[PDB]
Amino acid sequence: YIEYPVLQKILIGLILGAIVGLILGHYGYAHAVHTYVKPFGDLFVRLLCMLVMPIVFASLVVGAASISPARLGRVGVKIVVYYLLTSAFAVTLGIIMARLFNPGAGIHLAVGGQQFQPHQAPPLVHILLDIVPTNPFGALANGQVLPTIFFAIILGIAITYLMNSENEKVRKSAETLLDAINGLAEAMYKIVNGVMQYAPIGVFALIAYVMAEQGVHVVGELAKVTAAVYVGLTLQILLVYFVLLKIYGIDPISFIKHAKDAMLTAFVTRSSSGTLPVTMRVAKEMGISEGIYSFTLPLGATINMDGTALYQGVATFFIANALGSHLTVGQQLTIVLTAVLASIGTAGVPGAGAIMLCMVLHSVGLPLTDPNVAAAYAMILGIDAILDMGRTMVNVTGDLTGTAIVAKTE
Amino acid sequence: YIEYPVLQKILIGLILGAIVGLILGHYGYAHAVHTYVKPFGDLFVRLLCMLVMPIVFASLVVGAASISPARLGRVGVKIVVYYLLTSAFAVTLGIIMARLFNPGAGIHLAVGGQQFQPHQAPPLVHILLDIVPTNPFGALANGQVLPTIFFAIILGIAITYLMNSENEKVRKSAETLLDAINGLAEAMYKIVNGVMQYAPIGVFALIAYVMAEQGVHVVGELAKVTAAVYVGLTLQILLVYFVLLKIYGIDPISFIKHAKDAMLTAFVTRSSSGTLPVTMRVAKEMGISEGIYSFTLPLGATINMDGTALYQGVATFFIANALGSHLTVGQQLTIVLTAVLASIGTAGVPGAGAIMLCMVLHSVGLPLTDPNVAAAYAMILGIDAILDMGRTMVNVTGDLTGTAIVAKTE
Amino acid sequence: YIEYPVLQKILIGLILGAIVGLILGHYGYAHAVHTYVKPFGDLFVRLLCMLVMPIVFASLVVGAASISPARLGRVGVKIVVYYLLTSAFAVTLGIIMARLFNPGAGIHLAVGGQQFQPHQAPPLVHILLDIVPTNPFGALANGQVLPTIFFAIILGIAITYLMNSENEKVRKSAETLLDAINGLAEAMYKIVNGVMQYAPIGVFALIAYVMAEQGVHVVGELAKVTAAVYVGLTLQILLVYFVLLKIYGIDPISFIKHAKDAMLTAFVTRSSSGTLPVTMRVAKEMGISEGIYSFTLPLGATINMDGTALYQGVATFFIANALGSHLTVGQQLTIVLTAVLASIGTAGVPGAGAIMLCMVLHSVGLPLTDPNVAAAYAMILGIDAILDMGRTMVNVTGDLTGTAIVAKTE
Ligand SMILES: [Hg+2]
Ligand SMILES: [Hg+2]
Ligand SMILES: [Hg+2]
Ligand SMILES: [Tl+]
Ligand SMILES: [Tl+]
Ligand SMILES: [Tl+]
Ligand SMILES: [Tl+]
Ligand SMILES: [Tl+]
Ligand SMILES: [Tl+]
């Protein structure tokens, strides 16, 4: 009988938890929480960490397959590096937000009561090589995202080159195989949506605990995050888009007035994928060639998830300082390196950035299995339902603003 | 040149072993056995444990795919829960047999000379979550059937939902991918048959050892098992079928006289799969609609393996008490929970229930790799060639008796 | 801008390294090498060891699929065992070369400064069973080639039997699934070629180090290898081919004069695969039936890589004695057992035998991860670009000489 609009359904869990949390935050100790409540939350998270691999894998082989040079027209080539570098400065800005805002510093948690100290990172030499799977499956089997990616990529590539062969039996193999991976990719997504319906019961149990414990000083950071994001966000639109809108003689203001229908749909639908109908509709509405938006719009909804890139860029810096940890340059550049190759997986749905987070964590040697991290992420996940809104509303903006740029360039 | 009818071929190994065992049971110590003989047996078992995963996996994703709601007509819906609950009480009865018969108590073995004590089971909290793979591959890679299942299922589901999409490229992906898994599924089966031809040389080496050692007090349990089964079995037909045959105004006695051809073929062919021709033949023979038996008969031959459910239900209780172990309620209900989701894999062939056993073992934390268990299962496997006969002859009965019930209901 | 003909491109790295090595072999200690140079080499090797599994797997399931009895005409049957036994004596000869030549004895290396002593090999009993994967994935995940093979094979088989079924849905499954594996298989190959373009930068860094260290006494073995090979090689042609050419009343000398175009193309192209056009051209040129060379030539270019079989047969014996190790009979027969089931994978491309080497190593418990082995293989790999030439030129010869033999037999 649970049919309600997801977003509220969650916001229902979200606003109602806080209180039931804080009201149980004074009276019956948070331990009842800890034993009767958390058990429902984690399942959630676990239900996510579950997917991370297949979807880190499948997604990126297929990801690569779309981008694979030059199984793309010079029209893509143009738009491609738009996306890269708009996704690239996106996070550059995420750090800026996260270097002027320090949410998590002043929350620092002891977990079980023990502070966390990271395991030593191997000589820069090794770390390189370590990207090269010693053995695909053996790497794939257990964590080690650094290679998992590397590989899957090189596959995607190799694959595109197989459809371009003399032999037909061969030319074929690719198609199928590839296809099959894809869909695995897809299935994921749909479990994601299945998950994002336990998401209400979920988000409730998690945050309630984080409010039950940590007192209330928490929300101060939580809205301090929300800030760091939106304020990053809205500024991104001004600093990058409006900046490049005029740089090809397109009126930025009007552009928005057109995209006003689609964006303020993305805001509330959060599905960069299911909101394709709306997107391509506005496309022609503002005078874009069929043969141009028919290709970019179905590609940027997936890749160039510039909004995600930031989210992580920031979310990262929340987590680290919540452990009271300092992020060493080398991994500061990793965050992004990752955070980008992250958004090449995503297809732009509900949980999206959340799961990736893990991914960016795991790469930077912050194993979730570690309770410190665990209880911290746990927060960000709760609220993710919110940040997600604006995030996906910008992912979308980012896609049209490329489209119009290559339609004028075209 | 080894061409002989499998069943005899085995019974040949089976009856001839016992003697050559017991005759070597008095004279040249069983150690010669242990060093020249067992080495051939185990290979067998190993040849089985080998398959368990793929076939625990492939089978259940595809399993799910057939059942996936509502990628089935309301005609299935009806028959579905017949099967469930006839498979469900089936094992309920298996426990009854195994609580009035206690085969294994009075055989209790020391293995290397050390008794076995089970590893502590995690707090009921964890055990739940532990069903959610932390990471598919990483779980899939090594045991942990509890999740392997959970997952594969949720996949099967997700998959059916992919063929029901707007996008065609998508609608496709499912089909193929799915397909491909399926066939992996199938291949298994055919190696199974390839195995069940080493089965003669196999069953010989195993039991001979168990007769070489353990003296003879063993057969007392072995025929005490055979009992517990058949007597469960024949009674199942009376207590359930004849019970529900009349409960829709169908004459049970006649029904049998019709099914008399097909069942007494299943008894001897043991292939719930290859015996489909015979099944559907009798179907119309007793007045069943084409559009009704064309769907149930090709589905119940695979799922609703009620005979299997018991076999395990019982086999379980043999093993445990052969170690001198007591089966805690919580895992007593697991056996079944499992034993059912077991028979959703199986396609109904030779080794069938045997392999699953492992599956139900592994779930209930009884690692075969442990010699105690190892030598015990080892027995059940030998004789499985027999119990199998009646077992598959009932699996079949169970399928027609549903069919006629929904054809009258229809 | 790196476009140059691969072979030179490498020989360029190869001849130029030696010197820059030896010149840095007297002056600035080899340690600069060790810290600025090796790091580039290994990557290479790592880039290979990476592939070994998929391609050990995919290749052999599909391998099996071609050979699977009797999903082949009695025309294959004939040619099949030609290939087997020409691949079989091939290596028999490889040992002969490697028992009269002892390259590596007189190079013996201390690695870090510690000699290597192999881990004890389990009782011959276990080792057998150990071929039967305890669990496919779990084996597949981490090394254990002995089973990986065994399994994949039994699959290939099982698969062919699935396309020969009553059920169509089934008949299908096989096709796709199979296909899909295949192509994975293929992709590999193409990354191989992608690798064999870092191969110049690669082969440079590796050998330079091995010249930087070990002084120069090395080349003495390196050309002593080159010897052991070519001299094995050219003799193989005389001892086997010319021997069996006349044994069916075909003139060996002429045969060569015909194959003179194709072989001396294989020598320089090293691609048993891309050189199929040339092969089948000469086929009719020397009077071979369309319906005969259309089947053997596209099968022997892949299987019956008799040249490979030797390479390893020998390469093995280089490595072992470079560690100062003695190769126990039981594993001496393994080398081959392997080395053959090796060449059933390969499709006959650039790196080919190199990677397999690993495979034959891993089986004979010589983990590359061990630096001793590591620095040694490392040599063989460098020069492999050379030996490869003759090797593939004979693989090819081996294929026509079967073809003509079954065309006369036919
Ligand atoms: Hg995660
Ligand atoms: Hg098992
Ligand atoms: Hg290797
Ligand atoms: Tl986007
Ligand atoms: Tl994406
Ligand atoms: Tl059945
Ligand atoms: Tl089944
Ligand atoms: Tl060849
Ligand atoms: Tl091959």
GROMACS .gro file of C-alpha atoms in nm, chain A residues 17-343:
model
  327
   17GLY     CA    1   1.296   1.140   1.225
   18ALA     CA    2   1.487   1.446   1.349
   19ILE     CA    3   1.219   1.519   1.605
   20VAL     CA    4   1.149   1.158   1.712
   21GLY     CA    5   1.527   1.147   1.733
   22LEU     CA    6   1.582   1.457   1.941
   23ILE     CA    7   1.277   1.376   2.158
   24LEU     CA    8   1.434   1.042   2.221
   25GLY     CA    9   1.753   1.253   2.242
   26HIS     CA   10   1.671   1.370   2.592
   27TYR     CA   11   1.454   1.096   2.744
   28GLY     CA   12   1.517   0.723   2.672
   29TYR     CA   13   1.887   0.700   2.593
   30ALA     CA   14   1.999   0.673   2.226
   31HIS     CA   15   2.103   0.316   2.294
   32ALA     CA   16   1.750   0.191   2.229
   33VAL     CA   17   1.802   0.366   1.900
   34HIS     CA   18   2.131   0.190   1.858
   35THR     CA   19   1.974  -0.154   1.904
   36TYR     CA   20   1.631  -0.123   1.750
   37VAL     CA   21   1.678   0.148   1.499
   38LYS     CA   22   2.020   0.157   1.339
   39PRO     CA   23   1.967  -0.212   1.232
   40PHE     CA   24   1.716  -0.082   0.984
   41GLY     CA   25   1.928   0.200   0.857
   42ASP     CA   26   2.246   0.019   0.781
   43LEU     CA   27   2.061  -0.239   0.581
   44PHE     CA   28   1.988   0.051   0.357
   45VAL     CA   29   2.352   0.153   0.324
   46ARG     CA   30   2.443  -0.210   0.288
   47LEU     CA   31   2.180  -0.227   0.019
   48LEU     CA   32   2.385   0.038  -0.157
   49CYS     CA   33   2.744  -0.068  -0.100
   50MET     CA   34   2.611  -0.389  -0.243
   51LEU     CA   35   2.570  -0.242  -0.585
   52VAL     CA   36   2.878  -0.032  -0.603
   53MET     CA   37   3.090  -0.285  -0.796
   54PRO     CA   38   2.884  -0.414  -1.081
   55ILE     CA   39   2.775  -0.052  -1.137
   56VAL     CA   40   3.125   0.078  -1.100
   57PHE     CA   41   3.220  -0.180  -1.354
   58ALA     CA   42   2.936  -0.223  -1.600
   59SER     CA   43   2.878   0.148  -1.614
   60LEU     CA   44   3.232   0.233  -1.706
   61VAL     CA   45   3.285  -0.024  -1.974
   62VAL     CA   46   2.971   0.097  -2.140
   63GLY     CA   47   3.064   0.454  -2.042
   64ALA     CA   48   3.391   0.414  -2.230
   65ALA     CA   49   3.200   0.254  -2.517
   66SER     CA   50   3.009   0.576  -2.586
   67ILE     CA   51   3.315   0.798  -2.567
   68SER     CA   52   3.559   0.559  -2.734
   69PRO     CA   53   3.767   0.751  -2.992
   70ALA     CA   54   3.681   0.767  -3.271
   71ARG     CA   55   3.358   0.573  -3.247
   72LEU     CA   56   3.213   0.926  -3.220
   73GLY     CA   57   3.167   1.212  -3.470
   74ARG     CA   58   3.383   1.528  -3.448
   75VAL     CA   59   3.056   1.679  -3.321
   76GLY     CA   60   3.096   1.468  -3.007
   77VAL     CA   61   3.467   1.542  -2.987
   78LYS     CA   62   3.368   1.908  -2.953
   79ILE     CA   63   3.098   1.846  -2.694
   80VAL     CA   64   3.298   1.577  -2.515
   81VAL     CA   65   3.568   1.802  -2.380
   82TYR     CA   66   3.312   2.067  -2.298
   83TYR     CA   67   3.166   1.808  -2.060
   84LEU     CA   68   3.503   1.697  -1.928
   85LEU     CA   69   3.618   2.044  -1.848
   86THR     CA   70   3.279   2.161  -1.717
   87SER     CA   71   3.281   1.850  -1.498
   88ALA     CA   72   3.650   1.927  -1.429
   89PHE     CA   73   3.615   2.284  -1.299
   90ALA     CA   74   3.289   2.179  -1.134
   91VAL     CA   75   3.476   1.989  -0.867
   92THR     CA   76   3.762   2.246  -0.863
   93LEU     CA   77   3.484   2.468  -0.735
   94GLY     CA   78   3.366   2.190  -0.499
   95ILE     CA   79   3.701   2.211  -0.320
   96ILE     CA   80   3.676   2.589  -0.308
   97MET     CA   81   3.337   2.555  -0.136
   98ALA     CA   82   3.490   2.294   0.090
   99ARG     CA   83   3.796   2.505   0.170
  100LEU     CA   84   3.591   2.815   0.266
  101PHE     CA   85   3.324   2.602   0.432
  102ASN     CA   86   3.452   2.336   0.670
  103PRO     CA   87   3.150   2.120   0.761
  104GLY     CA   88   3.265   1.826   0.974
  105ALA     CA   89   3.536   2.019   1.151
  106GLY     CA   90   3.352   2.078   1.482
  107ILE     CA   91   3.158   1.752   1.453
  108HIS     CA   92   3.465   1.522   1.486
  109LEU     CA   93   3.360   1.184   1.613
  110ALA     CA   94   3.517   0.904   1.810
  111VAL     CA   95   3.298   0.623   1.671
  112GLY     CA   96   3.335   0.340   1.924
  113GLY     CA   97   3.535   0.593   2.121
  114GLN     CA   98   3.856   0.548   1.916
  115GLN     CA   99   3.985   0.813   1.668
  116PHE     CA  100   4.071   0.694   1.319
  117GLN     CA  101   4.423   0.696   1.172
  118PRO     CA  102   4.461   0.601   0.805
  119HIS     CA  103   4.680   0.318   0.688
  120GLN     CA  104   5.008   0.427   0.530
  121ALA     CA  105   4.996   0.479   0.151
  122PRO     CA  106   5.245   0.278  -0.053
  123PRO     CA  107   5.536   0.435  -0.232
  124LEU     CA  108   5.402   0.650  -0.514
  125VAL     CA  109   5.570   0.398  -0.742
  126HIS     CA  110   5.356   0.104  -0.636
  127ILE     CA  111   5.035   0.306  -0.623
  128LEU     CA  112   5.075   0.368  -0.996
  129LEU     CA  113   5.130   0.011  -1.095
  130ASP     CA  114   4.853  -0.089  -0.856
  131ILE     CA  115   4.612   0.060  -1.100
  132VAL     CA  116   4.704  -0.222  -1.336
  133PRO     CA  117   4.507  -0.516  -1.206
  134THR     CA  118   4.731  -0.796  -1.117
  135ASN     CA  119   4.433  -1.002  -1.218
  136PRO     CA  120   4.094  -0.864  -1.326
  137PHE     CA  121   3.866  -1.102  -1.136
  138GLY     CA  122   4.091  -1.113  -0.830
  139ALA     CA  123   4.078  -0.733  -0.822
  140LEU     CA  124   3.717  -0.720  -0.918
  141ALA     CA  125   3.634  -0.967  -0.647
  142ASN     CA  126   3.748  -0.739  -0.364
  143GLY     CA  127   3.744  -0.361  -0.364
  144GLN     CA  128   4.049  -0.210  -0.531
  145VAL     CA  129   3.848   0.040  -0.736
  146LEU     CA  130   4.168   0.204  -0.869
  147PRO     CA  131   4.222  -0.087  -1.109
  148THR     CA  132   3.864  -0.198  -1.149
  149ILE     CA  133   3.815   0.129  -1.326
  150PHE     CA  134   4.136   0.129  -1.519
  151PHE     CA  135   4.051  -0.209  -1.653
  152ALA     CA  136   3.685  -0.178  -1.733
  153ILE     CA  137   3.785   0.136  -1.930
  154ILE     CA  138   4.048  -0.031  -2.137
  155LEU     CA  139   3.791  -0.287  -2.210
  156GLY     CA  140   3.524  -0.041  -2.326
  157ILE     CA  141   3.785   0.090  -2.564
  158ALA     CA  142   3.906  -0.246  -2.687
  159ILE     CA  143   3.541  -0.337  -2.745
  160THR     CA  144   3.455  -0.053  -2.978
  161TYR     CA  145   3.750  -0.156  -3.185
  162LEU     CA  146   3.603  -0.504  -3.224
  163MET     CA  147   3.288  -0.385  -3.404
  164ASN     CA  148   3.519  -0.222  -3.657
  165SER     CA  149   3.674  -0.556  -3.779
  166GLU     CA  150   3.697  -0.745  -4.108
  167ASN     CA  151   3.555  -1.060  -3.956
  168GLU     CA  152   3.182  -1.051  -3.900
  169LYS     CA  153   3.152  -1.326  -3.635
  170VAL     CA  154   3.391  -1.096  -3.453
  171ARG     CA  155   3.214  -0.766  -3.536
  172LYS     CA  156   2.920  -0.942  -3.377
  173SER     CA  157   3.077  -1.073  -3.057
  174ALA     CA  158   3.137  -0.717  -2.947
  175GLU     CA  159   2.781  -0.603  -3.002
  176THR     CA  160   2.628  -0.883  -2.790
  177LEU     CA  161   2.884  -0.912  -2.517
  178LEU     CA  162   2.884  -0.540  -2.484
  179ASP     CA  163   2.511  -0.520  -2.483
  180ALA     CA  164   2.494  -0.783  -2.216
  181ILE     CA  165   2.712  -0.598  -1.980
  182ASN     CA  166   2.489  -0.305  -2.048
  183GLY     CA  167   2.165  -0.393  -1.882
  184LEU     CA  168   2.350  -0.547  -1.603
  185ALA     CA  169   2.437  -0.185  -1.582
  186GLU     CA  170   2.071  -0.108  -1.619
  187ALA     CA  171   1.930  -0.359  -1.382
  188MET     CA  172   2.134  -0.199  -1.112
  189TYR     CA  173   1.967   0.127  -1.164
  190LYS     CA  174   1.630  -0.028  -1.120
  191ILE     CA  175   1.719  -0.193  -0.799
  192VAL     CA  176   1.840   0.148  -0.702
  193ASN     CA  177   1.487   0.272  -0.750
  194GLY     CA  178   1.361  -0.035  -0.561
  195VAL     CA  179   1.600   0.070  -0.285
  196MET     CA  180   1.496   0.427  -0.299
  197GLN     CA  181   1.157   0.298  -0.177
  198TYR     CA  182   1.299   0.150   0.135
  199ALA     CA  183   1.467   0.492   0.131
  200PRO     CA  184   1.191   0.642   0.347
  201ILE     CA  185   1.215   0.372   0.622
  202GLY     CA  186   1.586   0.398   0.566
  203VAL     CA  187   1.662   0.769   0.585
  204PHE     CA  188   1.442   0.774   0.899
  205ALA     CA  189   1.645   0.517   1.093
  206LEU     CA  190   1.985   0.659   1.003
  207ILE     CA  191   1.952   1.026   1.084
  208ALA     CA  192   1.742   0.962   1.389
  209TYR     CA  193   2.046   0.789   1.531
  210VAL     CA  194   2.280   1.067   1.428
  211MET     CA  195   2.042   1.305   1.607
  212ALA     CA  196   1.993   1.069   1.896
  213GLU     CA  197   2.370   1.087   1.934
  214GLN     CA  198   2.588   1.389   1.856
  215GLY     CA  199   2.316   1.597   2.023
  216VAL     CA  200   2.217   1.873   1.787
  217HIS     CA  201   2.544   2.053   1.708
  218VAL     CA  202   2.510   1.833   1.398
  219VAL     CA  203   2.238   2.020   1.211
  220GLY     CA  204   2.465   2.322   1.229
  221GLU     CA  205   2.695   2.135   0.993
  222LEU     CA  206   2.413   1.972   0.801
  223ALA     CA  207   2.261   2.298   0.697
  224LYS     CA  208   2.624   2.422   0.673
  225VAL     CA  209   2.666   2.156   0.409
  226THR     CA  210   2.339   2.229   0.236
  227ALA     CA  211   2.478   2.578   0.218
  228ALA     CA  212   2.822   2.480   0.081
  229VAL     CA  213   2.638   2.299  -0.193
  230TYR     CA  214   2.361   2.528  -0.311
  231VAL     CA  215   2.582   2.827  -0.280
  232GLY     CA  216   2.846   2.642  -0.476
  233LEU     CA  217   2.572   2.540  -0.713
  234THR     CA  218   2.397   2.863  -0.792
  235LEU     CA  219   2.745   3.018  -0.829
  236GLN     CA  220   2.856   2.750  -1.071
  237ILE     CA  221   2.573   2.862  -1.296
  238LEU     CA  222   2.696   3.221  -1.274
  239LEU     CA  223   3.075   3.162  -1.284
  240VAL     CA  224   3.079   2.899  -1.556
  241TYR     CA  225   2.759   2.891  -1.759
  242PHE     CA  226   2.668   3.261  -1.781
  243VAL     CA  227   3.040   3.303  -1.838
  244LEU     CA  228   3.043   3.070  -2.140
  245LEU     CA  229   2.690   3.149  -2.255
  246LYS     CA  230   2.794   3.496  -2.363
  247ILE     CA  231   3.137   3.370  -2.482
  248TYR     CA  232   2.962   3.243  -2.795
  249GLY     CA  233   2.705   3.521  -2.828
  250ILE     CA  234   2.413   3.338  -2.669
  251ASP     CA  235   2.196   3.527  -2.424
  252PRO     CA  236   2.228   3.350  -2.088
  253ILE     CA  237   1.913   3.502  -1.927
  254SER     CA  238   1.676   3.390  -2.202
  255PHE     CA  239   1.836   3.050  -2.223
  256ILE     CA  240   1.731   3.000  -1.862
  257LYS     CA  241   1.377   3.128  -1.917
  258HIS     CA  242   1.351   2.849  -2.176
  259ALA     CA  243   1.517   2.585  -1.960
  260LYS     CA  244   1.293   2.708  -1.676
  261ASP     CA  245   1.041   2.430  -1.751
  262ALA     CA  246   1.299   2.146  -1.771
  263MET     CA  247   1.527   2.243  -1.481
  264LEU     CA  248   1.248   2.301  -1.233
  265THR     CA  249   1.129   1.959  -1.340
  266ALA     CA  250   1.475   1.804  -1.275
  267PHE     CA  251   1.486   1.967  -0.934
  268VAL     CA  252   1.177   1.766  -0.838
  269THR     CA  253   1.211   1.449  -1.050
  270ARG     CA  254   1.584   1.394  -0.975
  271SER     CA  255   1.600   1.150  -1.271
  272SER     CA  256   1.846   1.285  -1.534
  273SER     CA  257   1.723   0.975  -1.729
  274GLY     CA  258   1.340   0.979  -1.715
  275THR     CA  259   1.347   1.356  -1.768
  276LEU     CA  260   1.486   1.316  -2.119
  277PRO     CA  261   1.141   1.365  -2.278
  278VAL     CA  262   1.117   1.712  -2.121
  279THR     CA  263   1.475   1.797  -2.213
  280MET     CA  264   1.463   1.730  -2.586
  281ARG     CA  265   1.127   1.908  -2.600
  282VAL     CA  266   1.278   2.238  -2.484
  283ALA     CA  267   1.570   2.168  -2.719
  284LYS     CA  268   1.380   2.239  -3.036
  285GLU     CA  269   1.177   2.498  -2.844
  286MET     CA  270   1.486   2.719  -2.820
  287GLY     CA  271   1.593   2.645  -3.176
  288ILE     CA  272   1.822   2.345  -3.176
  289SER     CA  273   1.880   2.117  -3.475
  290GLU     CA  274   1.725   1.770  -3.455
  291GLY     CA  275   2.050   1.607  -3.562
  292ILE     CA  276   2.232   1.788  -3.282
  293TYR     CA  277   2.025   1.754  -2.965
  294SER     CA  278   1.932   1.398  -3.057
  295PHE     CA  279   2.293   1.305  -2.976
  296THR     CA  280   2.416   1.541  -2.703
  297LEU     CA  281   2.107   1.533  -2.480
  298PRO     CA  282   2.105   1.150  -2.458
  299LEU     CA  283   2.476   1.156  -2.373
  300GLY     CA  284   2.511   1.445  -2.129
  301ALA     CA  285   2.221   1.317  -1.919
  302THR     CA  286   2.456   1.032  -1.842
  303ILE     CA  287   2.809   1.174  -1.869
  304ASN     CA  288   2.891   1.531  -1.769
  305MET     CA  289   2.729   1.499  -1.440
  306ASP     CA  290   2.896   1.820  -1.326
  307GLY     CA  291   2.658   1.854  -1.026
  308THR     CA  292   2.761   1.513  -0.895
  309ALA     CA  293   3.136   1.602  -0.932
  310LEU     CA  294   3.094   1.885  -0.689
  311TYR     CA  295   2.870   1.693  -0.446
  312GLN     CA  296   3.146   1.443  -0.394
  313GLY     CA  297   3.420   1.708  -0.414
  314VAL     CA  298   3.246   1.857  -0.112
  315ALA     CA  299   3.102   1.546   0.057
  316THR     CA  300   3.456   1.420   0.066
  317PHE     CA  301   3.572   1.717   0.274
  318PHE     CA  302   3.283   1.679   0.506
  319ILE     CA  303   3.376   1.322   0.581
  320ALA     CA  304   3.750   1.367   0.627
  321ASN     CA  305   3.724   1.650   0.878
  322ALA     CA  306   3.441   1.469   1.057
  323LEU     CA  307   3.712   1.218   1.140
  324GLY     CA  308   3.940   1.512   1.204
  325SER     CA  309   4.155   1.413   0.906
  326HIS     CA  310   4.371   1.629   0.672
  327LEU     CA  311   4.347   1.551   0.293
  328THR     CA  312   4.696   1.522   0.139
  329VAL     CA  313   4.755   1.673  -0.205
  330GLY     CA  314   4.798   1.374  -0.430
  331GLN     CA  315   4.472   1.235  -0.297
  332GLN     CA  316   4.309   1.577  -0.311
  333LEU     CA  317   4.368   1.552  -0.685
  334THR     CA  318   4.255   1.189  -0.665
  335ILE     CA  319   3.914   1.282  -0.527
  336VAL     CA  320   3.846   1.460  -0.851
  337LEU     CA  321   4.033   1.225  -1.084
  338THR     CA  322   3.791   0.980  -0.932
  339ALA     CA  323   3.488   1.204  -0.888
  340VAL     CA  324   3.491   1.257  -1.263
  341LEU     CA  325   3.541   0.897  -1.369
  342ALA     CA  326   3.264   0.852  -1.114
  343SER     CA  327   3.006   1.059  -1.306
   0.00000   0.00000   0.00000
